[PDB]
Ligand SMILES: O=P(O)(O)C(Nc1cncc(-c2ccc(OC3CC3)cc2)c1)P(=O)(O)O
Ligand SMILES: O=P(O)(O)C(Nc1cncc(-c2ccc(OC3CC3)cc2)c1)P(=O)(O)O
Ligand SMILES: [Mg+2]
């Protein structure tokens with residue numbers, strides 16, 4: 001597993017990241033820099049680092065070994081950490097917005113005593129650190145502007161997606177007719193697929209001098225479909241995953257979300273089951289959440305997910321055969337192996 | 345008043361801004377684009393537009409009339425609106441973090457029914473719109489990267505400042521010893537002075553081809569001091585301003601903030617008054633807030649502010665004599681006239 005190979009060096013670059021962002025010229029901001037170090041240590045560390053690692057792995061596979069010198073590698077590990085900072089920004093904010101309880105095996109940052117809504121600022125600081133790192137490591141490289149624009153555009157797309165997520169899930173307002181497959185695909189494309197799948201591979205592409213519109217469009221055809229699958233898996237794991245593996249408690253039913261689970265339910269339900277769903281969805285009561293889960297189990301949605309995972313894998317692999325060239329297929333296969341059969 | 349001169353054209357460019365950000369290629373995101381239009385209309389409109397207008401006014405004074413063609417002006421009005429979008433991002437988030445009630449004469453966006461913490465996303469979308477506009481209007485200009493970096497750096501500095509604001513004001517944790525003049529100056533420099541004063545003038549400087557390190561450092565010496573004064577005035581108006589002019593209810597005492605008022609109080613108080621301050625600061629109770637205000641009145645802080653405003657004006661005007669050249673002094677005088685004697 002190429003992610004295992006690269007992982008140790010990537011994780012150890014984090015001290016470096018923390019040291020370059022937390023230092024000398026302005027001691028008047030030291031208390032703020034100390035707080036940033038706490039935010040970084042609590043929120044950017046404890047995941048799987050798959051999005052950032054995808055940058056590094058892809059870079060190694062796209063760049064000739066002769067061009068993978070010491071400084072080129074520091075830049076690739078830095079840009080990977082930029083992706084992880086992006087994720088950390090997003091998760092901190094999303095946990096607030098979703099009223100989540102745990103994340104990565106610990107209490108959400110905003111739930112910690114003495115943090116609360118100051119987390120809004122902490123999150124945005126994480127976002128700022130991306131642009132600082134790109135400037136400190138990549139400003140003299142011919143891909144600098146391409147990466148700045150990629151991160152900014154990926155944030156915009158992701159924020160548009162999140163707007164669709166929140167709008168399709170108004171609190172205390174159950175209208176099941178909104179929850180369609182078409183709407184679902186739109187939400188997940190924007191909220192998850194661009195940043196989680198296109199972004200890291202595209203960053204590596206740009207670092208390797210692959211800036212062509214056509215090469216980017218082809219990669220995207222693979223990567224956005226991978227991303228859809230990933231978010232479907234995320235939705236399934238929200239309810240049916242083991243939290244000691246996922247590291248977080250699910251909130252989709254209580255938060256009235258347009259999950260893949262509820263879309264599948266709606267496609268299968270009898271009128272009677274529809275009414276049960278309607279009376280019990282989008283509400284905080286533990287027994288109403290439990291009724292919805294029982295309904296999903298009654299309608300064999302775990303088995304449906306397992307079948308969808310098989311079919312989607314196949315479809316993605318077909319897209320790799322179709323759209324990988326002229327890049328090495330391993331770039332996409334490494335990422336597919338990571339996500340398929342994930343229960344994490 | 346040069347701000348009055350420029351204002352009408354600037355405000356009417358807002359329809360244009362809204363039309364270019366809210367349209368054709370992706371109807372799947374229309375609901376999100378509709379929501380963005382609502383956010384823009386509620387939050388970016390109803391202020392004084394002074395920060396954005398400073399861009400336009402400065403641009404006109406720094407660029408030869410022969411170079412102030414139709415497209416150059418659209419770009420300058422767009423970059424002004426980018427500054428206003430930045431402000432709107434910041435105010436939406438800050439109102440949440442400060443538990444504020446009103447802003448610009450209406451209920452804060454997050455307090456509106458059916459908004460709540462979804463405002464965190466709405467705020468960040470406003471931030472994203474800045475980079476979209478810079479790309480759509482300025483990408484082929486030799487100052488493009490300079491402006492991207494300026495906005496990003498100004499956001500970072502502002503977020504560092506906000507971190508110092510929140511840290512020096514922990515909820516329910518009164519320690520008056522933290523509230524020093526030195527700490528105060530640091531907070532306001534970072535949280536307010538960079539983005540409100542250096543940013544708009546520097547953007548115009550860059551648009552006019554003035555990119556020199558020395559020219560920027562000189563402007564900054566004026567503009568950061570102006571910004572300190574502005575935030576002192578903001579702190580004074582938090583308590584002693586008329587909300588029908590300011591458009592917002594103050595929260596500094598309840599929120600335990602390191603305001604200029606509390607720093608001045610601490611410098612003047614007897615041990616007995618110190619104890620009163622200590623027992624009544626940083627608490628939600630209306631009568632405790634009222635006691636603090638009575639103490640500030642007893643210690644003549646309104647008269648102290650009026651004297652400080654005179655001395656600061658003088659000092660700023662001295663800095664303009666010192667540091668304006670080779671730019672026209674009017675660039676700085678127009679902005680000083682706007683802020684001095686402001687009660688708004
Ligand atoms: O990890 P989670 O299961 O909570 C997923 N989290 C997730 C997935 N994709 C995008 C986001 C996201 C991105 C930006 C956000 O806010 C921007 C201003 C920060 C909020 C959430 C968050 P989701 O809530 O969609 O099930
Ligand atoms: O208009 P207000 O009186 O509320 C002032 N508002 C203000 C002044 N300077 C900076 C900010 C600001 C900037 C960024 C923020 O959050 C970033 C993630 C958005 C929050 C607040 C907010 P303050 O709270 O400092 O008295
Ligand atoms: Mg979530």
Ligand SMILES: [Mg+2]
Nearest residue numbers: 094097098165
């Ligand atoms: Mg969410």
Ligand SMILES: [Mg+2]
Nearest residue numbers: 234235238252
């Ligand atoms: Mg989820």
Ligand SMILES: [Mg+2]
Nearest residue numbers: 438439442444
């Ligand atoms: Mg405030």
Ligand SMILES: [Mg+2]
Nearest residue numbers: 438441442509
């Ligand atoms: Mg504030």
Ligand SMILES: [Mg+2]
Nearest residue numbers: 578579582596
């Ligand atoms: Mg204030």
